[PDB]
Every structure is written in C-alpha cells, then in structure tokens.
Design an enzyme around this catalytic site. Sequence first.
Site, short mmCIF file in Angstrom:
data_model
loop_
_atom_site.label_atom_id
_atom_site.label_comp_id
_atom_site.label_asym_id
_atom_site.label_seq_id
_atom_site.Cartn_x
_atom_site.Cartn_y
_atom_site.Cartn_z
CG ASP A 192 -5.69 -2.33 3.63
OD1 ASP A 192 -4.86 -2.99 2.99
OD2 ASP A 192 -5.37 -1.32 4.37
CD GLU A 216 -3.32 -6.92 4.14
OE1 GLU A 216 -3.87 -5.98 4.79
OE2 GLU A 216 -2.08 -6.92 3.84
C1 LIG Z 1 2.03 -3.57 4.11
C2 LIG Z 1 1.34 -4.43 5.12
O1 LIG Z 1 1.94 -4.09 6.40
C3 LIG Z 1 1.45 -4.82 7.47
O2 LIG Z 1 1.92 -6.17 7.34
C4 LIG Z 1 3.00 -6.61 8.22
C5 LIG Z 1 2.45 -7.71 9.13
O3 LIG Z 1 1.37 -7.23 9.90
C6 LIG Z 1 3.55 -8.20 10.04
O4 LIG Z 1 3.11 -9.22 10.93
C7 LIG Z 1 4.76 -8.62 9.26
O5 LIG Z 1 4.47 -9.88 8.58
C8 LIG Z 1 5.32 -10.96 8.98
C9 LIG Z 1 4.28 -12.11 9.18
O6 LIG Z 1 3.36 -11.83 10.25
C10 LIG Z 1 5.03 -13.37 9.59
O7 LIG Z 1 4.11 -14.41 9.80
C11 LIG Z 1 6.06 -13.69 8.46
O8 LIG Z 1 6.87 -14.74 8.83
O9 LIG Z 1 6.94 -12.56 8.31
C12 LIG Z 1 6.22 -11.41 7.89
C13 LIG Z 1 7.16 -10.36 7.47
O10 LIG Z 1 7.90 -9.93 8.64
O11 LIG Z 1 5.13 -7.65 8.32
C14 LIG Z 1 4.14 -7.19 7.41
C15 LIG Z 1 4.69 -6.20 6.49
O12 LIG Z 1 5.26 -5.19 7.23
C16 LIG Z 1 -0.04 -4.82 7.65
O13 LIG Z 1 -0.45 -5.74 8.61
C17 LIG Z 1 -0.72 -5.11 6.29
O14 LIG Z 1 -2.10 -4.91 6.47
C18 LIG Z 1 -0.15 -4.21 5.19
N1 LIG Z 1 -0.86 -4.43 3.89
C19 LIG Z 1 -2.07 -3.51 3.44
C20 LIG Z 1 -1.95 -2.16 4.17
C21 LIG Z 1 -1.64 -0.99 3.58
C22 LIG Z 1 -1.95 0.29 4.25
O15 LIG Z 1 -3.36 0.53 3.75
C23 LIG Z 1 -1.19 -0.87 2.18
O16 LIG Z 1 0.04 -0.12 2.01
C24 LIG Z 1 0.01 1.20 1.47
O17 LIG Z 1 0.48 2.17 2.40
C25 LIG Z 1 1.86 1.97 2.72
C26 LIG Z 1 2.16 2.93 3.88
O18 LIG Z 1 1.96 4.32 3.42
C27 LIG Z 1 2.72 2.22 1.47
O19 LIG Z 1 4.09 1.99 1.75
C28 LIG Z 1 5.07 2.50 0.80
O20 LIG Z 1 5.10 3.96 0.74
C29 LIG Z 1 5.59 4.51 1.98
C30 LIG Z 1 5.56 6.02 1.84
C31 LIG Z 1 6.98 3.95 2.24
N2 LIG Z 1 7.60 4.53 3.48
C32 LIG Z 1 8.52 5.68 3.35
C33 LIG Z 1 8.07 6.88 4.15
C34 LIG Z 1 8.67 7.29 5.24
C35 LIG Z 1 8.16 8.49 5.99
O21 LIG Z 1 6.83 8.80 5.59
C36 LIG Z 1 9.89 6.59 5.79
O22 LIG Z 1 9.81 6.57 7.20
C37 LIG Z 1 10.00 5.17 5.23
O23 LIG Z 1 11.22 4.56 5.65
C38 LIG Z 1 9.92 5.25 3.72
O24 LIG Z 1 10.26 4.02 3.08
C39 LIG Z 1 6.96 2.43 2.35
O25 LIG Z 1 8.21 1.84 2.56
C40 LIG Z 1 6.38 1.86 1.07
O26 LIG Z 1 6.26 0.46 1.19
C41 LIG Z 1 2.25 1.15 0.45
O27 LIG Z 1 2.87 1.35 -0.86
C42 LIG Z 1 0.79 1.27 0.19
O28 LIG Z 1 0.31 0.26 -0.73
C43 LIG Z 1 -0.96 -2.26 1.61
O29 LIG Z 1 -0.72 -2.16 0.22
C44 LIG Z 1 -2.13 -3.17 1.93
O30 LIG Z 1 -2.23 -4.41 1.22
#
Ligand SMILES: C[C@H]1O[C@H](O[C@H]2[C@H](O)[C@@H](O)[C@@H](O[C@H]3[C@H](O)[C@@H](O)[C@H](O)O[C@@H]3CO)O[C@@H]2CO)[C@H](O)[C@@H](O)[C@@H]1N[C@H]1C=C(CO)[C@@H](O[C@H]2O[C@H](CO)[C@@H](O[C@H]3O[C@H](C)[C@@H](N[C@H]4C=C(CO)[C@@H](O)[C@H](O)[C@H]4O)[C@H](O)[C@H]3O)[C@H](O)[C@H]2O)[C@H](O)[C@H]1O
Length: 441
Positions: A192, A216
């Site tokens: 990750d 990733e």
């Molecule tokens: C998820 C992913 O995020 C990051 O990716 C970024 C990327 O780095 C950026 O550059 C960009 O991507 C661009 C790309 O670069 C461009 O080339 C292209 O053109 O456009 C894209 C899109 O703009 O965006 C992406 C996505 O943001 C990281 O780099 C990547 O490594 C990540 N994937 C990994 C990582 C994790 C963490 O180990 C896993 O996620 C797990 O943890 C998250 C966070 O806890 C969880 O998220 C869910 O649950 C949350 C609780 C929720 N948030 C709520 C909570 C709040 C307060 O606590 C509120 O503030 C908030 O508003 C609430 O919604 C999240 O919304 C919800 O998604 C995941 O469920 C969990 O799995 C990934 O799974 C893993 O693969």
Amino acid sequence: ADTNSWKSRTIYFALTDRVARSASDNGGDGCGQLQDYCGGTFKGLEGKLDYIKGMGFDAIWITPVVQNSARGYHGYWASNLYATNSHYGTSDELKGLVNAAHGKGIYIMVDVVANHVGNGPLNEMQPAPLNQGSSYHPACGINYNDQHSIETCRVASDLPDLDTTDPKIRTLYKDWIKWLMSTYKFDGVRIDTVKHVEKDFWPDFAWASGSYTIGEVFSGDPNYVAGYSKLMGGLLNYPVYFPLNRFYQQQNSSQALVDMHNQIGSLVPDPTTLGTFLDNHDNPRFLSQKNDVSLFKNALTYVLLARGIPIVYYGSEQAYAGGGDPQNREDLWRSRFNTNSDMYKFFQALGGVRKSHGGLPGNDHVHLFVESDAYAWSRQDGAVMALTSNIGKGQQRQFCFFTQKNNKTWRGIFDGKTYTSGGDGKLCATVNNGEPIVFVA
Ligand SMILES: C[C@H]1O[C@H](O[C@H]2[C@H](O)[C@@H](O)[C@@H](O[C@H]3[C@H](O)[C@@H](O)[C@H](O)O[C@@H]3CO)O[C@@H]2CO)[C@H](O)[C@@H](O)[C@@H]1N[C@H]1C=C(CO)[C@@H](O[C@H]2O[C@H](CO)[C@@H](O[C@H]3O[C@H](C)[C@@H](N[C@H]4C=C(CO)[C@@H](O)[C@H](O)[C@H]4O)[C@H](O)[C@H]3O)[C@H](O)[C@H]2O)[C@H](O)[C@H]1O
Ligand SMILES: OC[C@H]1O[C@H](O[C@H]2[C@H](O)[C@@H](O)[C@@H](O)O[C@@H]2CO)[C@H](O)[C@@H](O)[C@@H]1O
Ligand SMILES: [Ca+2]
C-alpha cells in the site's frame, strides 16, 4: 513465489470482510452498513476457493490481516502488527486459509501497510515503539503537488504517518514482514501507499518479504509511477487505468490506451510484472460509471488478455455496480455466489483461454487494429487474438484488420465460429450486441 512465477498468474482481489461469512455461507441478505464490519471471515473465504478457481483465478489478493483500530473492516488501520484481525479469525484460521489455497494450487497475496497506523489511541499501538508519539511525523495536510508533503503528511487526517526514515522503524517493519511471510506462508505482497514513503525505504522492505511485491503508486503519470519500478517486483498499472476507462466508457479513442500501454511499458524494467485493472476498492465500479455490460466485457477482455498480470476486483463476476467507497465494497453473499451468472461465465471463458496458453506471461502483445471505436491485439505469435470495441450494447459493426498471419484459422470462443484470414492475413469480423470477440487457434 518469485516475480517469474507471478507473471503467469490471474488475480482475484477481495476484501476479506466482504466475501463470505462462514464455510456454510451460500448466500443471504446483504450487509446494510458498508462502512462497518459485514462479517466476512478467513473461514468464509476458504469455503469459496472453488468458486474463485471456477472462473480461472489462481491467486487471491486479500486486504491487510493485522489487528486494526475500530471499524477498520478494510484492514488499512493497523493497531497491532503481531496480531491477526479477530473479526476475520485467529492466526490458526489464517494459516488454514493459506494452506487450503496451496492445496488447490492458489497463491495468496497479502496487502501490507508501512506508511501509517490506524486511528485508535496511541497507547494501544503495538509493538513498541508504535505507542510513542516520536515514531510519527507531526500531523499535516497533504499537498499532492509536493513530494515532501506526500511523504511526510497524513494520507487521511486521523492516520498517523510513520517516521520511516528512522532506523528503528525501518528494522521494525523488516522484521515484521519477515515474520509475517514465514508464519503464514503467503506467496506475494501488495504494498500500500508506496508514493507516501521515501524511495530508499522500499528495496530493503521488499527483499525482506522474500516474494514478489507489487506496489500501489496512485498516479496517472507514467514517468512518476515508473520512478518506483526498480524498487519492487511490479506496480499496479494506474497509468493504463485512466485511458482504459476513457476508451471503454465511450469518452475517448483507443489511441490513448495504446499510447499509455506503450509508454508505461517502455519506462519499467519488465512490463510483464505490471498489474492490469479496470476498477478496485478505491474508485467507483465500472458499471456505476457506465451501465453497459457489453462495454464492461470489452474492457475486461483487455484486463485478462493484455500484457501484464490481470487483477479483477471481487464482485465484477456478479455485475456489481456500486459507486464511491464504501458503496463499491458490497458483500458477495447478497449475490448467492451464482456460478451461472453472465459475468461469471464470461470470466470463466477468458480464464480458459489463459490456462490453455500458459497464463500468457510473455512480452508479446502485438497491436493489430487501433481506431476511434475499436482495438484488436494478439498474444503468443497469433495463437490468441482479441477484437474489442466501445460501440456499446445493441450495436453491430464490421471491423477488418491485418492479423500478420497468412491463411490462418481461429475459433471464436464465444460464438464457436471459424475465422480464416486471407492470403494477406486480413480478417473481417462482425461485432454483435457490442460484444468482444476472442479468437483462439
Ligand atoms: C485512497 C488512496 O488515496 C491516495 O490516492 C490519491 C492520489 O495519491 C492522488 O494523486 C489523487 O490521484 C489522482 C491521480 O494522481 C491523477 O493522476 C489522476 O488524474 O487523478 C487522480 C484523482 O484525483 O487522488 C488519489 C485518491 O485520493 C493515496 O495515494 C493512495 O495510496 C490511497 N490508496 C490506499 C491507501 C489507503 C490508506 O491505507 C486505503 O484506504 C483506507 O483508508 C481510508 C482512509 O481512512 C478509507 O477511507 C474511507 O473511510 C474514511 C473514514 C472516509 N473519510 C471520512 C472521515 C472523516 C473524518 O475522519 C471526514 O473528514 C471525511 O470527509 C469522511 O468521508 C473516506 O472518505 C473513505 O473513503 C478507505 O476506505 C480505506 O480503504 C486504500 O484502500 C489503499 O488502496
Ligand atoms: O488500425 C490503425 C493502426 O493501428 C496500429 O498502429 C498503432 C501503433 O501500433 C501504435 O504504436 C501507435 O503508433 O498507434 C498506431 C495507430 O495510430 C496497427 O499497428 C496498425 O497496423 C494499424 O494500421
Ligand atoms: Ca509517509
């Protein structure tokens, strides 16, 4: 298992909490609150190994296995590295899952996190020194245009970011991955959050794994992604993901997919080690974005028969259509594990093509036909050939293209028809219902 062994594998990517509840789970009313534990277990996944194999998968990537903070159903919120997540089962049940998979010729790939811990209290983190504030960077909001920020700021506001340049933290994680791999006998690792840790952390960690590692790096920029390619065995093909979806969702021509396939391939050491995917747990499902099973099938034909290691997201075989996280993490038991569904039988057919051709591990993907609405390619010196299009359901077209094989005969795996190229190697075929045509000698 080593990179060379993984090049011929076909991966089913599953959330452990979302596959099956027990060995006796043959279906049920779905899970209502997708942001909380739905009750999938190791023992439930063990009872579904035949279901997975029956589509042609021979490897499963499971989400992280370590004890998590509250509500960490997805595994990414570590709280104790040296304990299993009790919601899925005990340590002995995790060994039983892996051993059962090995008895069926299936690899298990484990997802691991080294960048961050969960959102539980610092004083419950294990092992030492993870319960010390000094083990982490001060909290800051990521700026995705600045690499320092990407590396030292928090991936989410509540997930402490480890001080991965500290030698003590580097040795904690190396010793841990060695224990994990030795204890449970995993065959590979998905890493990750690779872009969020400094590059010189990774080689030692990957080598400590003792197996193939796939990282990733969430970015569409092939130059950026390929800068991590010498640090581990392979990378998830995020660069291809974007124009793959744009072509098969009728947004752009096939040319941008072919261009990106060529570009990322040229920039990594060995493009056969890249993981090809259409959707996953961090993006809306394909059918949420474009509700057309013919277009999904065409896109999945690329995932399965293109250069690289296919990675299919669980629930694709039941035509799941949920949108952004957590709605794309539906339980599988609502589907009653239907091995007669349209998509199940589709994956099974492409799995049979892969099996009959060695798992297609070669760097042998020949572009044949590259147009506004169509893309064809072959593998293995013309033994396998795919014609795909983005015309969509209910549409018919004729496509004619040079195969580079004179007077050759193929069978269409879906339609049973005999296709024969001319003396010039030219073949014409008519697409019906917008469906892909796969050709086998
Ligand atoms: C998820 C992913 O995020 C990051 O990716 C970024 C990327 O780095 C950026 O550059 C960009 O991507 C661009 C790309 O670069 C461009 O080339 C292209 O053109 O456009 C894209 C899109 O703009 O965006 C992406 C996505 O943001 C990281 O780099 C990547 O490594 C990540 N994937 C990994 C990582 C994790 C963490 O180990 C896993 O996620 C797990 O943890 C998250 C966070 O806890 C969880 O998220 C869910 O649950 C949350 C609780 C929720 N948030 C709520 C909570 C709040 C307060 O606590 C509120 O503030 C908030 O508003 C609430 O919604 C999240 O919304 C919800 O998604 C995941 O469920 C969990 O799995 C990934 O799974 C893993 O693969
Ligand atoms: O069907 C048009 C054309 O498609 C292919 O050419 C590709 C080429 O392979 C790519 O590297 C890049 O250059 O895009 C071209 C299409 O614009 C076939 O290779 C070619 O035979 C065919 O005429
Ligand atoms: Ca970091």
